[PDB]
Design a protein around this ligand. Structure first.
Ligand SMILES: Cc1cc2nc3c(=O)[nH]c(=O)nc-3n(C[C@H](O)[C@H](O)[C@H](O)COP(=O)(O)OP(=O)(O)OC[C@H]3O[C@@H](n4cnc5c(N)ncnc54)[C@H](O)[C@@H]3O)c2cc1C
Ligand SMILES: Cc1cc2nc3c(=O)[nH]c(=O)nc-3n(C[C@H](O)[C@H](O)[C@H](O)COP(=O)(O)OP(=O)(O)OC[C@H]3O[C@@H](n4cnc5c(N)ncnc54)[C@H](O)[C@@H]3O)c2cc1C
Ligand SMILES: O=C(O)c1ccc(O)cc1O
Ligand SMILES: O=C(O)c1ccc(O)cc1O
Ligand SMILES: [Br-]
Ligand SMILES: [Br-]
Ligand SMILES: [Br-]
Ligand SMILES: [Br-]
Lengths: 394, 394
């Protein structure tokens, strides 16, 4: 079996990369460990940057998004009883973000991939990578018991945090950066109208709360929760009572509650590996880095890694410029570290930490008061929130 | 013995407050524990904000400053081999800072006080405060052995961190915020031309370094040093070799070194007390709060507390508005917390901390790269550096 670019993983990264490549005439095969239905059952991200919205259009997979996605021009931050709005559009020079669920994007791409007929192998068991430093690397996997080999020129590891690709690079070639936060997010998806037309991030003494949305009739809420909590310990009712307890009263009063469609706990983490490649293997998305969701950068960073890898593969195949591929990590890492810093900052100012002394609490409050009341402070939040510019290469 | 306003301490705060009050017709007596020469021997701050420069003019003590002070329009920050300049003037909307030593300001005020004939009692031993909540508080002290009593309407505690005034307020009425940093600054004053026309803050792997000045022929340099260091362990030569080791080579090459006129180690600290008053006692300057010197806010905060207290005392004496004095702490604390936050931020990004993991180091570097390369980031540094606006009261 043979292809040009082998792609491990069919989440947003793998599908987006694959779609881009296919439209340009570069053969690519995707290997996914799960079934399509399993991948489609993941409720995750909901905020997309301008850059990602353009990459979807470029991949020709934007019809449904242009119809159903909500364009937001601001986000609110509530702390100490007051609600402060950040005008993203005015402060960033006219950029906005688009709210459209990750499940939707994945569904749009999977459909687009099916229609064009490109190769996708689900239930690809025991994927293994070989000859990463040769001229002809290959992948082996098991489809219903028999071991099959797939030959390619390059391998794109788009298998997420627990994927096999990052684990395939000799640990001594890698430099790992990581911070684990002492809390997670308990998220809840409901078929009720969102409480606000825009998102509300909330710093409350009991912990962080976030009011988000998926459509005009579907909502998503999160509340900061310690690592000891179990999802079965949180009935729908306990969640609504806690959410209400963390929001300003004029917001809590108009909250339409309802039974959960999905409920889960996601732990917060920061993680970066350098470099992001090894021989003919290139990492993209969660396979290479993790950000706490506070800044909504995860899926967005995945898009920029992919945007970069794709353009570098094009130069390589169409222009015979195979040497530019060495620049992948340098290019990606610049944007990644700034997104990691924004995510970390957002996380530290909106969440309540366990053993904080009096001084740190006052500083946290003052960070908010300064950044939310200063035109220059608001602009730092805004330009980072909408998304810093993609570097163009060459 | 009787006066209207008793002032404890003859450093910048006490003298400035006293001078302002005197010019407006409000009698005031200053009690200082040391001799004039001792106070004059302290080498400390060198950077003055616009607001402080105007308060000096208002006190009519600005002739020498207008002549010898250096107006700076920018400051440089060096990290990872590169030097980045922050244009304060362009970024803050035209404000600048003025470099004029603290010793000079103190000398100008002491001279001004002498000429106008206001009462200053040096070597005022064992100062004690009494009847703080009555209508007539008083101060007792010892001048060459005999105990004298001074009656007044109000007491301004301008006695610094180790003064008696903060210690005179019942500890249960006070709320203390404090952070101690695991390092200090080893400063050196030399009679050599400064290495740059503007200040250079430096983040280097060996620790922080700062190149400052006092005049066109006098310089002041600092290098971050751990708490274990003793000044007698640092010969002039050891200092120059370390300073040079922490600066970019094109800067180190042109450094004119020389024997020290003064050399000392100042530990870094953050400290705030709330409220800043008790009955007829009002705290000002270091008596109420400490900031690490990284943002040059100490003497500047002292000026704003004093500017506020003075205007409130004027309303009280001239207008019979004695009730406005209750607003002192609320007014002062707003500016103080923002200055404390700026100082903390500057400190955390320019200094090397002892037990930092890989992630934090990368974030520290990225903080600098973001704030120094973003127009909005640069503006946050600039408006804070020149000094946020003084609140006007009423
Ligand atoms: C559980 C979780 C919750 C999250 N929640 C949020 C959230 O609420 N908000 C938010 O803003 N962001 C959230 N994120 C982050 C955001 O969803 C991601 O950054 C985004 O999904 C990254 O896409 P990806 O393609 O890189 O990774 P993924 O979506 O993880 O896709 C990787 C894919 O590769 C497959 N794969 C794994 N191992 C192998 C293998 N050995 N062989 C073959 N295929 C393999 C997996 O089955 C998976 O389909 C979350 C991430 C996770 C892991
Ligand atoms: C040792 C030290 C080093 C510093 N170094 C720097 C530096 O390098 N850079 C910088 O930016 N800032 C520095 N600062 C901070 C800056 O100098 C101050 O914020 C500024 O001096 C505050 O002025 P003040 O009048 O409030 O206090 P001070 O200048 O401390 O004056 C308070 C005065 O009150 C007197 N006093 C004390 N106790 C009594 C008493 N019991 N009775 C009567 N009088 C009393 C003292 O003798 C003193 O004269 C430093 C502060 C200190 C303490
Ligand atoms: O799921 C969301 O809608 C969502 C929105 C904002 C954010 O920062 C993180 C999130 O997961
Ligand atoms: O003494 C200085 O000149 C000086 C300058 C800048 C600064 O932040 C701190 C300082 O003590
Ligand atoms: Br979703
Ligand atoms: Br995220
Ligand atoms: Br000085
Ligand atoms: Br200071």
């Amino acid at each position: 079996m043979k292809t040009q670019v082998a792609i491990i993983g069919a989440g947003p990264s793998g599908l987006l990369l694959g779609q881009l490549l296919h439209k340009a005439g570069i053969d690519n095969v995707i290997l996914e460990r799960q079934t399509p239905d399993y991948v489609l059952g993941r409720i995750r991200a909901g905020v997309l940057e301008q850059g990602m919205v353009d990459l979807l259009r470029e991949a020709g997979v934007d019809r449904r998004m242009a119809r159903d996605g909500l364009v937001h021009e601001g986000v609110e931050i509530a702390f100490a009883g007051q609600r402060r709005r950040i005008d993203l559009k005015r402060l960033s020079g006219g950029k906005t973000v688009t709210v459209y669920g990750q499940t939707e994007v994945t569904r749009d791409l999977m459909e687009a991939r099916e229609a064009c007929g490109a190769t996708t192998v689900y239930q690809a068991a025991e994927v293994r990578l070989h000859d990463l430093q040769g001229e002809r690397p290959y992948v082996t996997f098991e489809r219903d018991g028999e071991r099959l080999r797939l030959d390619c020129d390059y391998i794109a590891g788009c298998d997420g945090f627990h994927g096999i690709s990052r684990q395939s690079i000799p640990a001594e070639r890698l430099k790992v950066f990581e911070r684990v936060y002492p809390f997670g997010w308990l998220g809840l998806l409901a078929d009720t109208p969102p409480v606000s037309h825009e998102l509300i991030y909330a710093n409350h003494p009991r912990g962080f709360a976030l009011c988000s949305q998926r459509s005009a009739t579907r909502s998503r809420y999160y509340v900061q929760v310690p690592l000891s909590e179990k999802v079965e310990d949180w009935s729908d009712e306990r969640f609504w009572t806690e959410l209400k307890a963390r929001l300003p009263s004029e917001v809590a009063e108009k909250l339409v509650t309802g039974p959960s469609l999905e409920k889960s706990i996601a732990p917060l983490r920061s993680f970066v590996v350098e470099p992001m490649q090894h021989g003919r293997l290139f990492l993209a998305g969660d396979a290479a880095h993790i950000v706490p969701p506070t800044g909504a950068k995860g899926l967005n960073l995945a898009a920029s890694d992919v945007s970069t890898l794709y353009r570098l593969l094009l130069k390589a195949y169409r222009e015979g410029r195979g040497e530019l591929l060495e620049r992948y990590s340098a290019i990606c890492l610049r944007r990644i570290w700034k997104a990691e810093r924004f995510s970390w900052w957002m996380t530290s100012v909106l969440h309540r930490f366990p053993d904080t002394d009096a001084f740190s609490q006052r500083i946290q409050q003052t960070e908010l008061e300064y950044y939310l009341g200063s035109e220059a402070g608001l602009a730092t939040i805004a330009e980072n929130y909408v998304g810093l510019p993609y570097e163009e290469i060459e």
